[PDB]
mmCIF file of C-alpha atoms and ligand atoms in Angstrom:
data_model
loop_
_atom_site.group_PDB
_atom_site.id
_atom_site.type_symbol
_atom_site.label_atom_id
_atom_site.label_comp_id
_atom_site.label_asym_id
_atom_site.label_seq_id
_atom_site.Cartn_x
_atom_site.Cartn_y
_atom_site.Cartn_z
ATOM 1 C CA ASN A 1 90.849 127.734 91.260
ATOM 2 C CA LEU A 2 87.958 125.996 93.515
ATOM 3 C CA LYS A 3 90.331 122.479 92.874
ATOM 4 C CA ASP A 4 93.165 124.326 94.047
ATOM 5 C CA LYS A 5 91.451 125.988 97.399
ATOM 6 C CA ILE A 6 90.438 122.455 98.282
ATOM 7 C CA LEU A 7 94.265 121.383 97.635
ATOM 8 C CA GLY A 8 95.320 124.614 99.622
ATOM 9 C CA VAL A 9 92.822 124.015 102.846
ATOM 10 C CA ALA A 10 93.671 120.464 102.992
ATOM 11 C CA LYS A 11 97.112 120.712 103.134
ATOM 12 C CA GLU A 12 97.196 123.188 105.891
ATOM 13 C CA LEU A 13 94.531 120.998 107.812
ATOM 14 C CA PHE A 14 96.720 118.198 107.373
ATOM 15 C CA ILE A 15 99.739 119.633 108.752
ATOM 16 C CA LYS A 16 97.535 121.188 112.058
ATOM 17 C CA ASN A 17 95.023 118.342 112.422
ATOM 18 C CA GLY A 18 96.897 115.140 110.984
ATOM 19 C CA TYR A 19 95.408 112.797 108.495
ATOM 20 C CA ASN A 20 92.947 110.962 109.928
ATOM 21 C CA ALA A 21 91.307 113.841 112.097
ATOM 22 C CA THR A 22 91.197 116.029 109.328
ATOM 23 C CA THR A 23 87.275 115.587 108.107
ATOM 24 C CA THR A 24 85.811 116.245 104.389
ATOM 25 C CA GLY A 25 83.594 118.731 105.954
ATOM 26 C CA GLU A 26 85.905 120.797 107.325
ATOM 27 C CA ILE A 27 87.587 120.479 103.652
ATOM 28 C CA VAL A 28 84.619 121.388 102.261
ATOM 29 C CA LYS A 29 83.217 124.397 104.511
ATOM 30 C CA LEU A 30 87.026 126.050 104.873
ATOM 31 C CA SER A 31 87.098 125.930 101.377
ATOM 32 C CA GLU A 32 83.879 127.329 100.386
ATOM 33 C CA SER A 33 83.519 124.537 97.908
ATOM 34 C CA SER A 34 81.029 122.001 97.982
ATOM 35 C CA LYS A 35 80.445 118.101 99.082
ATOM 36 C CA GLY A 36 79.667 117.343 95.089
ATOM 37 C CA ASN A 37 82.361 119.444 93.802
ATOM 38 C CA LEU A 38 84.909 116.927 95.974
ATOM 39 C CA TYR A 39 83.633 114.008 95.143
ATOM 40 C CA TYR A 40 83.862 115.571 91.314
ATOM 41 C CA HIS A 41 87.632 116.240 91.555
ATOM 42 C CA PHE A 42 88.684 113.522 94.221
ATOM 43 C CA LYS A 43 86.269 110.575 95.015
ATOM 44 C CA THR A 44 88.311 110.171 98.614
ATOM 45 C CA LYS A 45 90.274 111.809 100.889
ATOM 46 C CA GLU A 46 92.682 109.471 100.159
ATOM 47 C CA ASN A 47 92.869 110.341 96.504
ATOM 48 C CA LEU A 48 92.681 113.852 97.816
ATOM 49 C CA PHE A 49 95.656 113.226 100.282
ATOM 50 C CA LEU A 50 97.695 111.513 97.418
ATOM 51 C CA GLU A 51 97.082 114.198 95.071
ATOM 52 C CA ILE A 52 98.646 116.789 97.530
ATOM 53 C CA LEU A 53 101.560 114.454 98.155
ATOM 54 C CA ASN A 54 102.042 114.844 93.859
ATOM 55 C CA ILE A 55 102.391 118.093 94.241
ATOM 56 C CA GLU A 56 104.607 118.475 97.200
ATOM 57 C CA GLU A 57 106.610 115.554 95.079
ATOM 58 C CA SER A 58 106.536 118.056 92.280
ATOM 59 C CA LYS A 59 107.886 120.904 94.063
ATOM 60 C CA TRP A 60 110.299 119.263 95.664
ATOM 61 C CA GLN A 61 111.446 117.919 92.189
ATOM 62 C CA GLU A 62 111.744 121.720 91.633
ATOM 63 C CA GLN A 63 113.473 122.454 94.511
ATOM 64 C CA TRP A 64 116.441 120.241 93.676
ATOM 65 C CA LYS A 65 116.262 121.072 90.305
ATOM 66 C CA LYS A 66 117.862 124.182 91.301
ATOM 67 C CA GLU A 67 119.554 123.073 94.505
ATOM 68 C CA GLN A 68 121.876 120.898 92.202
ATOM 69 C CA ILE A 69 123.597 123.816 90.544
ATOM 70 C CA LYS A 70 126.111 124.174 93.068
ATOM 71 C CA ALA A 71 127.051 120.198 92.628
ATOM 72 C CA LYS A 72 129.731 119.826 89.416
ATOM 73 C CA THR A 73 129.942 116.069 89.311
ATOM 74 C CA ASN A 74 127.843 113.295 90.158
ATOM 75 C CA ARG A 75 129.774 111.838 92.783
ATOM 76 C CA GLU A 76 128.758 115.404 94.271
ATOM 77 C CA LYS A 77 125.300 115.261 93.210
ATOM 78 C CA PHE A 78 124.731 112.070 95.310
ATOM 79 C CA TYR A 79 126.421 112.899 98.619
ATOM 80 C CA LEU A 80 124.389 116.267 98.460
ATOM 81 C CA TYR A 81 121.131 114.780 97.681
ATOM 82 C CA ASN A 82 121.245 112.210 100.419
ATOM 83 C CA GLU A 83 121.799 114.972 102.342
ATOM 84 C CA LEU A 84 118.916 117.340 101.684
ATOM 85 C CA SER A 85 116.736 114.660 102.081
ATOM 86 C CA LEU A 86 118.118 114.082 105.560
ATOM 87 C CA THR A 87 118.005 117.632 106.524
ATOM 88 C CA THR A 88 114.812 118.663 104.653
ATOM 89 C CA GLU A 89 112.887 116.347 106.389
ATOM 90 C CA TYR A 90 113.547 117.804 109.996
ATOM 91 C CA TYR A 91 111.886 120.601 109.256
ATOM 92 C CA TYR A 92 109.208 119.307 106.748
ATOM 93 C CA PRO A 93 105.531 119.456 108.497
ATOM 94 C CA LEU A 94 103.592 117.180 106.384
ATOM 95 C CA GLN A 95 105.470 114.457 107.157
ATOM 96 C CA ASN A 96 103.152 113.015 110.164
ATOM 97 C CA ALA A 97 100.308 113.551 108.248
ATOM 98 C CA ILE A 98 102.032 110.942 105.489
ATOM 99 C CA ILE A 99 103.641 108.648 108.111
ATOM 100 C CA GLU A 100 100.083 108.706 109.588
ATOM 101 C CA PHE A 101 98.499 107.831 106.074
ATOM 102 C CA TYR A 102 101.143 105.517 104.738
ATOM 103 C CA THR A 103 100.925 103.140 108.066
ATOM 104 C CA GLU A 104 97.316 102.971 107.656
ATOM 105 C CA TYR A 105 96.666 103.004 103.281
ATOM 106 C CA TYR A 106 99.789 100.012 103.258
ATOM 107 C CA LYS A 107 98.049 97.153 103.386
ATOM 108 C CA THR A 108 95.666 98.463 100.428
ATOM 109 C CA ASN A 109 97.312 97.439 97.411
ATOM 110 C CA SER A 110 94.391 99.760 95.959
ATOM 111 C CA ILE A 111 96.577 102.849 97.212
ATOM 112 C CA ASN A 112 99.641 100.974 97.783
ATOM 113 C CA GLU A 113 99.843 101.273 94.008
ATOM 114 C CA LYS A 114 98.824 104.833 93.320
ATOM 115 C CA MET A 115 101.769 104.963 96.380
ATOM 116 C CA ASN A 116 104.466 103.052 94.542
ATOM 117 C CA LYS A 117 103.753 105.370 90.919
ATOM 118 C CA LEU A 118 104.947 108.275 93.447
ATOM 119 C CA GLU A 119 107.494 106.424 95.040
ATOM 120 C CA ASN A 120 109.093 105.886 91.490
ATOM 121 C CA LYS A 121 109.384 109.901 91.181
ATOM 122 C CA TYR A 122 111.519 110.013 94.039
ATOM 123 C CA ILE A 123 113.458 107.388 92.904
ATOM 124 C CA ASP A 124 114.262 108.684 89.632
ATOM 125 C CA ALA A 125 116.541 111.218 91.184
ATOM 126 C CA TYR A 126 118.849 108.701 91.559
ATOM 127 C CA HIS A 127 118.239 106.909 88.320
ATOM 128 C CA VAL A 128 119.480 110.250 86.501
ATOM 129 C CA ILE A 129 122.714 110.747 88.728
ATOM 130 C CA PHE A 130 123.985 107.317 88.462
ATOM 131 C CA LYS A 131 122.894 107.431 84.260
ATOM 132 C CA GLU A 132 124.898 110.719 83.966
ATOM 133 C CA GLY A 133 128.050 109.613 86.326
ATOM 134 C CA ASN A 134 128.176 106.751 83.395
ATOM 135 C CA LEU A 135 128.112 108.733 80.773
ATOM 136 C CA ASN A 136 130.988 111.175 82.544
ATOM 137 C CA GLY A 137 132.614 107.866 83.490
ATOM 138 C CA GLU A 138 132.289 108.623 86.982
ATOM 139 C CA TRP A 139 132.074 105.034 87.979
ATOM 140 C CA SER A 140 130.788 101.941 85.695
ATOM 141 C CA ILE A 141 127.018 101.159 86.884
ATOM 142 C CA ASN A 142 124.921 98.756 84.413
ATOM 143 C CA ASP A 143 121.632 98.267 86.171
ATOM 144 C CA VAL A 144 120.640 101.536 87.067
ATOM 145 C CA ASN A 145 117.227 100.763 87.736
ATOM 146 C CA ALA A 146 118.340 98.291 90.613
ATOM 147 C CA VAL A 147 121.142 100.371 91.768
ATOM 148 C CA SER A 148 118.607 103.326 92.016
ATOM 149 C CA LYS A 149 116.472 101.503 94.087
ATOM 150 C CA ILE A 150 118.607 99.984 96.318
ATOM 151 C CA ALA A 151 120.087 103.784 97.047
ATOM 152 C CA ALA A 152 116.664 105.370 97.619
ATOM 153 C CA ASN A 153 115.427 102.767 100.096
ATOM 154 C CA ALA A 154 118.949 102.739 101.984
ATOM 155 C CA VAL A 155 119.243 106.490 102.215
ATOM 156 C CA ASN A 156 115.019 106.241 103.036
ATOM 157 C CA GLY A 157 115.759 104.160 105.987
ATOM 158 C CA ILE A 158 118.997 105.957 107.338
ATOM 159 C CA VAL A 159 116.746 109.324 107.350
ATOM 160 C CA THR A 160 113.626 107.648 108.957
ATOM 161 C CA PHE A 161 115.053 104.809 111.593
ATOM 162 C CA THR A 162 117.782 107.604 112.935
ATOM 163 C CA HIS A 163 115.368 110.092 114.846
ATOM 164 C CA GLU A 164 117.009 109.633 118.337
ATOM 165 C CA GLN A 165 120.719 110.307 117.379
ATOM 166 C CA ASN A 166 121.214 114.508 117.558
ATOM 167 C CA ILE A 167 121.398 116.125 113.692
ATOM 168 C CA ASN A 168 125.301 116.502 113.487
ATOM 169 C CA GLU A 169 125.535 112.822 113.999
ATOM 170 C CA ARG A 170 122.787 111.763 111.728
ATOM 171 C CA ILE A 171 124.410 114.156 109.217
ATOM 172 C CA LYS A 172 127.534 112.614 109.905
ATOM 173 C CA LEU A 173 125.939 108.947 109.148
ATOM 174 C CA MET A 174 124.274 109.974 106.074
ATOM 175 C CA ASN A 175 127.967 111.438 104.480
ATOM 176 C CA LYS A 176 129.402 108.170 105.664
ATOM 177 C CA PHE A 177 126.883 105.913 103.667
ATOM 178 C CA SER A 178 127.182 108.061 100.849
ATOM 179 C CA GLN A 179 130.842 107.062 100.847
ATOM 180 C CA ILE A 180 130.779 103.471 101.351
ATOM 181 C CA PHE A 181 127.779 103.318 99.041
ATOM 182 C CA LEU A 182 129.721 105.081 96.355
ATOM 183 C CA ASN A 183 132.918 103.325 97.110
ATOM 184 C CA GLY A 184 131.473 100.023 96.582
ATOM 185 C CA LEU A 185 130.322 101.284 92.876
ATOM 186 C CA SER A 186 134.059 101.052 91.487
ATOM 187 C CA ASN B 1 98.065 82.114 130.172
ATOM 188 C CA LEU B 2 97.029 85.440 131.081
ATOM 189 C CA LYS B 3 100.165 87.974 130.299
ATOM 190 C CA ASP B 4 101.474 85.577 128.432
ATOM 191 C CA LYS B 5 97.931 85.531 126.114
ATOM 192 C CA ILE B 6 97.707 89.460 126.516
ATOM 193 C CA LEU B 7 101.216 90.338 124.754
ATOM 194 C CA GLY B 8 100.160 87.356 122.402
ATOM 195 C CA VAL B 9 97.315 90.189 121.475
ATOM 196 C CA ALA B 10 98.853 93.161 121.321
ATOM 197 C CA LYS B 11 101.934 91.521 119.451
ATOM 198 C CA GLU B 12 99.434 91.274 116.594
ATOM 199 C CA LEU B 13 97.218 94.122 117.076
ATOM 200 C CA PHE B 14 100.066 96.442 116.634
ATOM 201 C CA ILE B 15 101.382 94.483 113.377
ATOM 202 C CA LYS B 16 97.848 94.393 111.998
ATOM 203 C CA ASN B 17 96.148 98.062 113.024
ATOM 204 C CA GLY B 18 98.793 99.935 114.209
ATOM 205 C CA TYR B 19 100.635 101.388 117.342
ATOM 206 C CA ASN B 20 97.108 103.727 117.629
ATOM 207 C CA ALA B 21 94.667 101.461 115.890
ATOM 208 C CA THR B 22 94.843 99.582 118.491
ATOM 209 C CA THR B 23 93.874 100.958 121.711
ATOM 210 C CA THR B 24 93.962 99.766 125.395
ATOM 211 C CA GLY B 25 90.503 98.794 125.477
ATOM 212 C CA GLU B 26 90.965 96.539 122.788
ATOM 213 C CA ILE B 27 94.151 94.181 123.596
ATOM 214 C CA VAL B 28 92.586 93.988 127.267
ATOM 215 C CA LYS B 29 89.235 92.799 125.343
ATOM 216 C CA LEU B 30 90.041 90.743 123.043
ATOM 217 C CA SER B 31 92.592 89.631 125.910
ATOM 218 C CA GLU B 32 90.142 88.374 128.189
ATOM 219 C CA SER B 33 91.407 90.344 130.878
ATOM 220 C CA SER B 34 90.836 92.925 133.024
ATOM 221 C CA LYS B 35 92.089 96.642 132.613
ATOM 222 C CA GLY B 36 93.812 96.118 136.040
ATOM 223 C CA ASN B 37 96.183 93.153 134.834
ATOM 224 C CA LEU B 38 97.329 95.557 132.684
ATOM 225 C CA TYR B 39 98.667 98.161 135.421
ATOM 226 C CA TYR B 40 100.986 95.591 137.631
ATOM 227 C CA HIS B 41 102.650 93.651 135.212
ATOM 228 C CA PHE B 42 102.773 96.542 132.009
ATOM 229 C CA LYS B 43 102.939 99.811 133.716
ATOM 230 C CA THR B 44 101.658 102.288 130.543
ATOM 231 C CA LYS B 45 100.363 101.056 127.009
ATOM 232 C CA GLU B 46 103.363 102.383 125.619
ATOM 233 C CA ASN B 47 105.007 100.521 128.084
ATOM 234 C CA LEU B 48 103.284 96.969 127.002
ATOM 235 C CA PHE B 49 104.873 98.075 123.339
ATOM 236 C CA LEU B 50 108.028 98.924 124.351
ATOM 237 C CA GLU B 51 107.721 95.431 126.080
ATOM 238 C CA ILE B 52 106.760 92.991 123.209
ATOM 239 C CA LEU B 53 109.346 94.729 121.315
ATOM 240 C CA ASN B 54 112.097 93.469 123.548
ATOM 241 C CA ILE B 55 110.416 90.485 123.097
ATOM 242 C CA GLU B 56 110.646 90.439 119.405
ATOM 243 C CA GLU B 57 114.393 91.624 119.223
ATOM 244 C CA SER B 58 115.404 88.664 121.134
ATOM 245 C CA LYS B 59 113.532 85.886 119.893
ATOM 246 C CA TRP B 60 114.847 87.271 116.143
ATOM 247 C CA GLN B 61 118.083 87.603 117.447
ATOM 248 C CA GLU B 62 117.842 84.161 118.689
ATOM 249 C CA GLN B 63 116.560 82.442 115.744
ATOM 250 C CA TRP B 64 119.742 84.451 114.003
ATOM 251 C CA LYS B 65 122.477 82.250 115.989
ATOM 252 C CA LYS B 66 120.388 79.335 115.661
ATOM 253 C CA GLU B 67 121.168 79.542 111.569
ATOM 254 C CA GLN B 68 123.905 81.571 111.310
ATOM 255 C CA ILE B 69 126.497 78.923 111.359
ATOM 256 C CA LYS B 70 125.079 77.841 107.648
ATOM 257 C CA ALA B 71 127.653 80.889 106.842
ATOM 258 C CA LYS B 72 130.867 80.198 107.144
ATOM 259 C CA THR B 73 132.955 83.307 106.775
ATOM 260 C CA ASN B 74 131.287 86.626 108.341
ATOM 261 C CA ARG B 75 131.386 88.262 104.927
ATOM 262 C CA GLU B 76 128.648 85.309 104.185
ATOM 263 C CA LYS B 77 127.291 85.864 108.035
ATOM 264 C CA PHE B 78 126.866 89.565 106.238
ATOM 265 C CA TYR B 79 125.090 88.524 102.845
ATOM 266 C CA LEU B 80 122.549 85.694 105.108
ATOM 267 C CA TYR B 81 121.429 87.977 108.097
ATOM 268 C CA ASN B 82 120.429 90.957 105.441
ATOM 269 C CA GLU B 83 118.914 88.049 103.409
ATOM 270 C CA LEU B 84 116.659 86.284 106.567
ATOM 271 C CA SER B 85 115.485 89.769 107.703
ATOM 272 C CA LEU B 86 113.481 89.871 105.105
ATOM 273 C CA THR B 87 112.124 86.486 105.665
ATOM 274 C CA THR B 88 111.755 86.838 109.375
ATOM 275 C CA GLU B 89 108.680 86.772 111.370
ATOM 276 C CA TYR B 90 109.989 88.617 114.298
ATOM 277 C CA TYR B 91 110.412 91.665 114.805
ATOM 278 C CA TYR B 92 110.631 93.658 111.604
ATOM 279 C CA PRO B 93 106.880 93.038 110.900
ATOM 280 C CA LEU B 94 106.121 95.821 113.546
ATOM 281 C CA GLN B 95 108.576 98.079 111.838
ATOM 282 C CA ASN B 96 105.790 100.580 111.045
ATOM 283 C CA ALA B 97 104.689 100.588 114.520
ATOM 284 C CA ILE B 98 107.540 101.840 115.519
ATOM 285 C CA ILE B 99 108.052 104.578 112.966
ATOM 286 C CA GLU B 100 104.514 105.727 114.195
ATOM 287 C CA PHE B 101 104.764 104.980 117.762
ATOM 288 C CA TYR B 102 108.119 107.106 117.509
ATOM 289 C CA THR B 103 106.775 110.005 115.898
ATOM 290 C CA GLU B 104 103.972 109.916 118.446
ATOM 291 C CA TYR B 105 105.559 109.939 121.757
ATOM 292 C CA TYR B 106 109.171 111.737 120.445
ATOM 293 C CA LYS B 107 108.014 114.758 122.347
ATOM 294 C CA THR B 108 108.622 112.846 125.416
ATOM 295 C CA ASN B 109 112.242 111.260 127.105
ATOM 296 C CA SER B 110 111.000 107.935 128.391
ATOM 297 C CA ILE B 111 111.645 107.672 124.395
ATOM 298 C CA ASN B 112 115.369 107.976 123.608
ATOM 299 C CA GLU B 113 115.804 106.460 127.403
ATOM 300 C CA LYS B 114 114.522 103.142 125.885
ATOM 301 C CA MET B 115 114.690 103.341 122.348
ATOM 302 C CA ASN B 116 118.452 103.889 122.169
ATOM 303 C CA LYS B 117 118.170 100.595 124.688
ATOM 304 C CA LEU B 118 116.131 98.746 121.682
ATOM 305 C CA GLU B 119 118.675 100.511 119.596
ATOM 306 C CA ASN B 120 121.743 98.626 120.902
ATOM 307 C CA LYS B 121 120.614 95.268 120.832
ATOM 308 C CA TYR B 122 119.386 96.121 117.482
ATOM 309 C CA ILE B 123 122.660 97.321 115.575
ATOM 310 C CA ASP B 124 124.776 94.934 117.972
ATOM 311 C CA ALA B 125 124.294 91.923 115.417
ATOM 312 C CA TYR B 126 126.524 93.964 112.542
ATOM 313 C CA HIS B 127 128.912 94.983 115.491
ATOM 314 C CA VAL B 128 129.961 91.848 115.815
ATOM 315 C CA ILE B 129 130.056 90.436 112.209
ATOM 316 C CA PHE B 130 131.854 93.358 111.694
ATOM 317 C CA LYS B 131 134.277 92.848 114.552
ATOM 318 C CA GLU B 132 135.131 89.402 113.760
ATOM 319 C CA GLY B 133 135.649 90.547 110.716
ATOM 320 C CA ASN B 134 138.605 92.654 111.420
ATOM 321 C CA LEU B 135 139.913 89.877 113.613
ATOM 322 C CA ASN B 136 139.201 86.967 110.803
ATOM 323 C CA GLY B 137 141.185 89.162 108.347
ATOM 324 C CA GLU B 138 138.044 89.679 105.912
ATOM 325 C CA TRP B 139 138.483 92.999 106.440
ATOM 326 C CA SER B 140 139.542 96.276 108.207
ATOM 327 C CA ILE B 141 137.233 98.355 109.782
ATOM 328 C CA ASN B 142 137.960 100.971 112.199
ATOM 329 C CA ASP B 143 134.556 102.693 113.284
ATOM 330 C CA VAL B 144 132.792 99.483 113.691
ATOM 331 C CA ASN B 145 130.021 101.016 115.577
ATOM 332 C CA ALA B 146 129.469 103.360 113.448
ATOM 333 C CA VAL B 147 129.328 101.050 110.432
ATOM 334 C CA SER B 148 127.270 98.950 112.319
ATOM 335 C CA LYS B 149 124.683 101.499 112.845
ATOM 336 C CA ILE B 150 124.823 102.946 108.986
ATOM 337 C CA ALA B 151 124.200 99.204 107.423
ATOM 338 C CA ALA B 152 121.802 98.306 109.894
ATOM 339 C CA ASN B 153 119.546 101.304 108.753
ATOM 340 C CA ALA B 154 120.233 101.187 105.398
ATOM 341 C CA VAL B 155 119.294 97.205 105.866
ATOM 342 C CA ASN B 156 115.989 98.255 107.593
ATOM 343 C CA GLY B 157 115.019 100.482 104.779
ATOM 344 C CA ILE B 158 115.305 98.323 102.653
ATOM 345 C CA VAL B 159 113.110 95.446 104.247
ATOM 346 C CA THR B 160 110.808 98.121 105.287
ATOM 347 C CA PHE B 161 110.241 100.313 102.250
ATOM 348 C CA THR B 162 109.572 97.429 99.773
ATOM 349 C CA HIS B 163 107.076 94.593 101.499
ATOM 350 C CA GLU B 164 104.554 95.063 98.571
ATOM 351 C CA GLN B 165 106.740 93.636 95.432
ATOM 352 C CA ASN B 166 107.515 90.070 95.073
ATOM 353 C CA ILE B 167 109.580 88.347 97.601
ATOM 354 C CA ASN B 168 112.263 87.089 95.405
ATOM 355 C CA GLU B 169 112.876 90.353 93.589
ATOM 356 C CA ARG B 170 113.796 91.667 97.591
ATOM 357 C CA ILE B 171 115.981 88.991 97.956
ATOM 358 C CA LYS B 172 117.599 89.950 94.870
ATOM 359 C CA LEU B 173 117.771 93.639 95.550
ATOM 360 C CA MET B 174 118.953 93.194 99.062
ATOM 361 C CA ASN B 175 121.945 91.348 97.882
ATOM 362 C CA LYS B 176 122.922 93.264 95.270
ATOM 363 C CA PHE B 177 122.937 96.013 98.420
ATOM 364 C CA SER B 178 124.938 94.006 100.409
ATOM 365 C CA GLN B 179 127.848 93.317 98.006
ATOM 366 C CA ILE B 180 127.581 96.844 96.917
ATOM 367 C CA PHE B 181 128.303 97.776 100.594
ATOM 368 C CA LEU B 182 130.641 95.349 101.647
ATOM 369 C CA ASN B 183 132.863 96.174 98.611
ATOM 370 C CA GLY B 184 132.968 99.686 99.884
ATOM 371 C CA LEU B 185 134.393 99.122 103.414
ATOM 372 C CA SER B 186 137.414 97.274 101.570
HETATM 373 C C1 BER C 1 111.908 121.342 101.955
HETATM 374 O O1 BER C 1 110.242 120.891 101.336
HETATM 375 C C2 BER C 1 110.736 119.707 101.225
HETATM 376 C C3 BER C 1 111.663 118.789 101.683
HETATM 377 C C4 BER C 1 111.562 117.171 101.682
HETATM 378 C C5 BER C 1 110.342 116.369 101.044
HETATM 379 C C6 BER C 1 110.267 114.911 101.005
HETATM 380 C C7 BER C 1 109.549 114.371 100.092
HETATM 381 N N1 BER C 1 108.322 115.137 99.180
HETATM 382 C C8 BER C 1 108.174 116.879 99.604
HETATM 383 C C9 BER C 1 109.251 117.121 100.047
HETATM 384 C C10 BER C 1 109.444 118.813 100.403
HETATM 385 O O2 BER C 1 108.420 119.537 99.316
HETATM 386 C C11 BER C 1 108.491 120.659 99.862
HETATM 387 C C12 BER C 1 107.106 114.498 98.417
HETATM 388 C C13 BER C 1 107.365 113.114 98.031
HETATM 389 C C14 BER C 1 108.608 112.089 98.939
HETATM 390 C C15 BER C 1 108.384 110.484 98.454
HETATM 391 C C16 BER C 1 109.602 110.108 99.133
HETATM 392 C C17 BER C 1 110.450 110.683 100.094
HETATM 393 C C18 BER C 1 110.421 112.084 100.779
HETATM 394 C C19 BER C 1 109.555 112.863 99.934
HETATM 395 O O3 BER C 1 111.375 109.673 100.710
HETATM 396 C C20 BER C 1 110.883 108.556 100.406
HETATM 397 O O4 BER C 1 109.860 108.948 99.962
#
């Protein structure tokens, strides 16, 4: 459990103080742990942070696994997933500590590698919507991996680079894109 | 020069270290300048940054015009614009700096007031490529302004969230996208 308490106190610390700002001395004392132990488990603050990101991503995966019960067809699952990504980012705290981490440990192929292994988990989501949609012939795509990376990064920049518009607008652009994209696949 | 040897050091500094990573002291120091210089020409530091942005947005917008003849129809102009975006040296590079800086000053108003200013220069290249396309007959888009905004960001996502993998796979990815997209329009 001492492992988990470290993960827990860290997530919080990162939300309240940001990334570069949180210190491992803090992490160790607030988790009533030890420097030694922390090294044993994570080796670095960067990996500590990465581990968190896996666990969040694990929750998200799970979160969505239930929210999708209200999407009967895959066309639907595509529109809904794109939206949830847009809406649920507004009020998702970690988001700042991530932006702060990514725009730093970005130039390190070292971290950037573990970073991608993770970026794929968020990409498979689509991978599946497209596969299924295929079997249920909702469309007939055939390089689901390419189309999937395209969708994940398109959606992603709509989410990221539109922060200046008021939410009722962003959610409007996003649904349109889902249509134009989905449209261009048939 | 002096003032043109400052922007010269900021540009690069922002691109390397980050929006934060590079501090006022940094700039001026490696800029061989006085901390006052900044004051009369470059108001604030976020100002020196919001400056290098239009600089970049123009240099690129310009380079685009000089090469956009290679593309005969507007449908070709679409692929090409997106294609070149991946390879330019202008603007796109400090796209990270942007993200960081937007979330680090979004709780102010000189943000939307000037972001949207740079954001209208940005999505403009598509405005014309789509507008003309209507005139040209290559397609019919009623919401051009909308579509421009959407396209510009999906594309900025692809250019940005893929900077690490083989430069040629990007051009491939980007082109299957430009296709899926133009397809959804007609
Ligand atoms: C409401 O809760 C949310 C909402 C949204 C979340 C979004 C993401 N994660 C947790 C979330 C979460 O965790 C609880 C972790 C992994 C991830 C990788 C990404 C991405 C978004 C996310 O964009 C592209 O790469």
